[PDB]
């Protein structure tokens, strides 16, 4: 039976707008591995337990949804992947797909993100000419 309210877990069609309308950074966690999900999501357990009320931790499939992993930055070249969509600035501070997706690595990374250490990697593309400026 019920045991509270849904927040961190699996991202769906009714959760996207909820994490986007919530007004807090969205922590996407793509993963082509739907078997060992516990491993990634575990290290993530704390990565969000620290930011449970500041970031929306939601897991996603990097095999079927992967296209959504880099729709904010990544290239969907490898997985699992991790994205950090900001619903305040509309930023996307995801993780690498050739480094190592652990806890200390994500928890620390995101930590360096929220703190104000991480910044856009590919985003930011203005349209000069008669327009803008």
Strand order from edge to edge, sheet including 9-10: 9-10, 56-60, 26-30, 81-85
Beta carbons within 8 Å of 44's beta carbon, 6+ residues apart: 27, 29, 57, 59, 103, 106
Say if residues 59 and 14 touch (Cβ distance below 8 Å).
no
What experiment produced this structure? NMR
Q: Which of 6, 22, 29, 9 minimizes the C-alpha distance to 109?
A: 29
Domains along the sequence of the chain with CATH: 8-116 (3.40.30.10)
| d(C-alpha 91, C-alpha 119), whole Å | 8
* 62 vs 80: CA distance, rounded Å: 6
Q: CB–CB of 44/103 below 8 Å?
A: yes
Report the C-alpha gap between 114 and 98 in whole angstroms: 22
């Amino acid at each position: 039976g019920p045991l509270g309210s849904p927040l961190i877990g699996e991202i769906g069609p009714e959760t996207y707008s909820d994490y986007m309308s919530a007004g807090i950074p969205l922590a996407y966690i793509f993963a082509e591995t739907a078997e060992e999900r516990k491993e990634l999501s575990d290290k993530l357990k704390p990565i969000a337990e620290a930011q449970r009320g500041v970031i929306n931790f939601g897991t996603i499939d990097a095999k079927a949804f992967g296209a959504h992993a880099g729709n904010l930055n990544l290239k969907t070249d490898k997985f699992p992947a991790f994205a950090i969509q900001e619903v305040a600035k509309n930023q996307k501070f995801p993780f690498d797909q050739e480094k190592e997706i652990t806890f200390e690595a994500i928890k620390a990374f995101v930590d360096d993100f929220v703190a104000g250490k991480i910044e856009p990697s590919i985003k930011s593309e203005p349209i000069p000419e008669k327009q803008e400026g």
